[PDB]
């Protein structure tokens, strides 16, 4: 008879294939509509995300479509891999929700950030983030919105990036919803609408790394006004060659803001935030601070590249020979609700 069954999880109704049993809300994190479940066909635990009416607006539609298309043609151990895609609805006209199935992880990166972590775990997580970012870049994907909530880890320290970031050759839109966008890991180029290269994501890694060390969000704020103030208070006002690459209007505001000297990296990340129990840890702390000082650089021309960050003494220890490639093996334009509903549906049907 029926291939699917419905279950009430939290507030939402999950209508899933009968193979997925004992659904449980993840909550943190999430929050997207995400459940843990047992997959009886694969005899393994999975995570199931529900996209409710993803074609309801262009923000939801572009993202849903882009991430459905990319989750198929992107293959890397540090990037989310899709196990299954389905809709409980029978026709295009009846089509409402999309379900995305992936391997169940144990935590998001925010939970790991709260922990006091050794240099082994810190550099391993960062090596993985850098590998995932390098793979995305090689496929012409520059993220620009990498944050700990969309990064997941397993107990064995393995890491996966969940999303593909900001829309390329676009272009943001209005949201009539009660949810807040996290902007604290965004690069100065993203804050000040500058134009960017691959190392735009290194800033995000720097923000995450710094927060793993400091246990506080490095650059907080209501919006980009407060946020940019947090950047300059700590790192100092950038040099004239950087400010020359700003739009006239943006350049005016940036230069007319009060000038700060900038705190040094030993002052920003004191010796006390790292273990001093051994000579190994003494060396690891100076190397960790050295990498942070190269990542948390306002000028992208003076900021470290992904490839150099991977070759850094703090990270380069995880470089594994005979690991490459992998052991197991359009369209940024304006569309209407109905046009997107069809694009997404045919992508769900493949
Ligand atoms: C295709 C797709 C599916 C889901 C997401 N979003 C997502 O958050 N996925 C995901 C995977 N794992 N986790 C996660 C995060 C935090 C905690 C837990 C957790 O509690 N996991 C367990 C629960 C019970 N047993 C075990 C062994 C782990 C899982 C989230 C994006 C794309």
Swiss-Prot record:
Catalytic reaction annotation: L-seryl-[protein] + ATP = O-phospho-L-seryl-[protein] + ADP + H(+); L-threonyl-[protein] + ATP = O-phospho-L-threonyl-[protein] + ADP + H(+)
Record-given protein name: Mitogen-activated protein kinase 10
Regulation: Activated by threonine and tyrosine phosphorylation by two dual specificity kinases, MAP2K4 and MAP2K7. MAP2K7 phosphorylates MAPK10 on Thr-177 causing a conformational change and a large increase in Vmax. MAP2K4 then phosphorylates Tyr-179 resulting in a further increase in Vmax. Inhibited by dual specificity phosphatases, such as DUSP1. Inhibited by HDAC9.
Residues of the full protein shown: 45 to 400 of 464
Gene designation per UniProt: MAPK10
Disease: A chromosomal aberration involving MAPK10 has been found in a single patient with pharmacoresistant epileptic encephalopathy. Translocation t(Y;4)(q11.2;q21) which causes MAPK10 truncation.
GO molecular function: ATP binding; JUN kinase activity; MAP kinase kinase activity; protein serine kinase activity
Annotated positions of the Phosphothreonine modification: 177
GO terms under cellular component: cytoplasm; cytosol; mitochondrion; nucleoplasm; nucleus; plasma membrane
């Amino acid at each position: 008879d029926n291939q699917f069954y419905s279950v009430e999880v939290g507030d939402s109704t999950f209508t899933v294939l009968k193979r997925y049993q004992n659904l449980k809300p993840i909550g943190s994190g999430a929050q997207g509509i995400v459940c843990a479940a047992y997959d009886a066909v694969l005899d393994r635990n999975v995570a199931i995300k529900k996209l409710s009416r993803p074609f309801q607006n262009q923000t939801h539609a572009k993202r849903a479509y882009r991430e459905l298309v990319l989750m198929k043609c992107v293959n890397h151990k540090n990037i989310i891999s899709l196990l299954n895609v389905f809709t409980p609805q029978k026709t295009l006209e009846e089509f409402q929700d999309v379900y995305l199935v992936m391997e169940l992880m144990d935590a998001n990166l925010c939970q790991v950030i709260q922990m006091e972590l050794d240099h082994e775990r810190m550099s391993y997580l960062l090596y993985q983030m850098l590998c995932g970012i390098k793979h995305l870049h090689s496929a012409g994907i520059i993220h620009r919105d990498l944050k700990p909530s969309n990064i997941v880890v397993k107990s064995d320290c393995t890491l996966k990036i969940l999303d593909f970031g900001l829309a390329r050759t676009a272009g943001t839109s209005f949201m009539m919803t009660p949810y807040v966008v996290t902007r604290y890991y965004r690069a100065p180029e993203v804050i000040l609408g500058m134009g960017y290269k691959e190392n735009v994501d290194i800033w995000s890694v720097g923000c995450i790394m710094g927060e793993m060390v400091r246990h506080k969000i490095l650059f907080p704020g209501r919006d980009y006004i407060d946020q940019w103030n947090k950047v300059i208070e700590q790192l100092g006002t950038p040099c004239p060659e950087f400010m020359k690459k700003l739009q006239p209007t943006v350049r005016n505001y940036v230069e007319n803001r009060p000038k700060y000297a900038g705190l040094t990296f030993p002052k920003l990340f004191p010796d006390s935030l790292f273990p001093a129990d051994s000579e190994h840890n003494k060396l690891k702390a100076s190397q960790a601070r050295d990498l942070l000082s190269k990542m948390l650089v306002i000028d992208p021309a003076k900021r470290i590249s992904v490839d150099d960050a991977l070759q850094h003494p703090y990270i380069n220890v995880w470089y594994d020979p005979a690991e490459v490639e992998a052991p197991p093996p359009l369209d940024e334009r304006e569309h209407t609700i109905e046009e997107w509903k069809e694009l997404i549906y045919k992508e769900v049907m493949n």
